[PDB]
């Protein structure tokens, strides 16, 4: 393989037929630097430090993604309309900081080995679906050309409150539930 | 399950010894099958599967597409790296250390929220570095430019967890005695 001190992905371009949804993002050492909002023509950086010292023209994303839509219609035509193979995603739930009943924390649900990149990552707190305090990352690329997504959940550890991560993917037969609770 | 057709392009840069030894590899991926790639060590587009010769040989004939991409090692890889040197590679996040158990012996030293990834954690019984019984988990990527690692270790004795990190001028030491 290619050994290197730092590996950057200056141009993680992605376009699929289903949506039709796409994504343009840069990554450095496996972490997402930014992603271009293709609907608003807006560059959304993933760090306060990046928003202050960096600039990226969002037009280069729409230009580059438009070429992907072009290149897609040919490899599907050349491969005789070969669809994607649904992979089974791997779900893991853990907390961001050590849990101290009463101290605010953040739950993390990592959904690994996603393909194709179409998934619902939703939270459940004591049965009820959580809608506030939920944020997630974009599709981060993997070395085997798959994807993984991470969803966050800001919560307050309590003696009687059990959280769940609900993942819906085509590779799964039923919605997969991962459990987490403070011992 | 509706069928989906995925196309990817990943222009990846590999840095070694700073901005000196730089390698550019652009990969054109259909679904998960990479069919054509450009390599800075090779210099031209190479076919990886039979789905690629019709595109790699066409891109080698045109000089405006092969010259624009060969120069991208300098206009994309080394150009963006100068901004990583003032933002990303300067990011220092101090680690939060916590020790707590899960007649046996299982102590969990949770070193959470730190960046960058270079970190050394050592276990100490009184002042004896534990070279055996250390069960360490791989580096966990939280996804928000922070990391996390859990180092486990399997009669009055003071066990301490020493965490050293570039974001720390002095090592963090947290102790835990059995009541």
């Amino acid at each position: 393989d290619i050994v290197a001190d730092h590996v950057a992905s200056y141009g993680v371009n992605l376009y699929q037929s289903y949506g039709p949804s796409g994504q343009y993002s840069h990554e450095f050492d496996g972490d997402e630097e930014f992603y271009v909002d293709l609907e608003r023509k807006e560059t959304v950086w993933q760090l306060p430090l990046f928003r202050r010292f960096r600039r990226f023209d969002p037009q280069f994303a729409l230009t580059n993604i438009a070429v992907l839509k072009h290149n897609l219609n040919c490899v599907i035509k050349r491969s005789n309309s070969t669809a994607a193979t649904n992979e089974v995603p791997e779900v893991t739930v853990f907390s961001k900081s050590p849990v101290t009943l009463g101290q605010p924390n953040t739950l993390i649900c990592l959904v690994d080995n996603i393909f194709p990149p179409v998934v619902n990552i939703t939270w459940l707190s004591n049965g009820h679906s959580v809608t506030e305090g939920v944020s997630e990352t974009s599709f981060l690329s993997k070395s085997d050309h798959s994807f993984f997504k991470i969803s966050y959940l800001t919560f307050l550890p309590s003696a009687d409150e059990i959280y769940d991560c609900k993942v819906e993917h085509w590779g799964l037969d039923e919605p997969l539930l991962k459990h987490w609770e403070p011992e | 399950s509706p069928e989906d057709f995925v196309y990817q392009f990943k222009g990846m840069c590999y840095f070694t010894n700073g901005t000196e030894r730089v390698r550019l590899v652009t990969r054109y991926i259909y679904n998960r099958e990479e069919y054509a790639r450009f390599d800075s060590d090779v210099g031209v587009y190479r076919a990886v599967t039979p789905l690629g010769p019709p595109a790699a040989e066409y891109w080698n004939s045109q000089k405006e597409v092969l010259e624009r991409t060969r120069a991208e090692l300098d206009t994309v890889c080394r150009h963006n790296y100068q901004l990583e040197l003032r933002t990303t590679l300067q990011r220092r996040v101090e680690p939060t250390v916590t020790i707590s158990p899960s007649h046996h012996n299982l102590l969990v030293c949770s070193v959470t929220d730190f960046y960058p990834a270079q970190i050394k954690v050592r276990w100490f019984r009184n002042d004896q570095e534990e070279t055996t019984g250390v069960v360490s988990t791989p580096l966990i990527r939280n996804g928000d430019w922070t990391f996390q690692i859990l180092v486990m270790l399997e009669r009055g004795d003071v066990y301490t967890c020493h965490v050293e990190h570039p974001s720390l001028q002095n090592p963090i030491i947290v102790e835990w005695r059995a009541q």
Binding site: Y10, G11, N13, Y24, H26, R54, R55, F56, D57, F60, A61, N64, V67, L68, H70, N71, N73, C74, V75 | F9, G11, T26, Y28, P54, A55, Y58, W59, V65, R68, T69, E72, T75, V76, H79, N80, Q82, L83
Partner: peptide, 14 residues
């Protein structure tokens, strides 16, 4: 300075 990314290459298509 202004950061930028790798330019994608067009396929033979039609």
């Amino acid at each position: 300075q202004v950061e930028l990314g790798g330019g994608n290459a067009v396929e033979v298509c039609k």
